[PDB]
Design a protein around this nucleic acid. Sequence first.
DNA 1: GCGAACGCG
DNA 2: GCGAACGCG
Length: 132
Amino acid sequence: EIIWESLSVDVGSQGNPGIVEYKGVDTKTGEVLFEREPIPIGTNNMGEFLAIVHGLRYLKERNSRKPIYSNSQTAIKWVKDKKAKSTLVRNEETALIWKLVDEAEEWLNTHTYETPILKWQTDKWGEIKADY
DNA sequence: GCGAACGCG
DNA sequence: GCGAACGCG
Ligand SMILES: [Mg+2]
């Protein structure tokens, strides 16, 4: 069933592409462990990808073997493949989201981890604790 | 390759 | 309606 000793991440989108925020919380308590301030233009899947990679970096900094829960099977696969397969144009308006994605891919390409990245089963378990 | 035909905000 | 992931020549 649920591994309560874990990190849960999720994205808050206003439009898609549109304003992106994300956060990571303690699955057990809902305590906010990290939060990303609004990024003016991104896609939902780019935000979910960034949330998982921020989680990987957060747990590594703290010598944690906790798994990560995401409700985004798309983003879980992007992280496994070390590539965010986004369609979003690269122009002046999207430079920030793409800089963050490119830096996240660089991190994945230059680090190893054991962190399990698990699917949060929303239908079966209810909303992920990191939900906005 | 051409375009059609989950889990949101 | 968005970003994701067939038959035909
Ligand atoms: Mg959510």
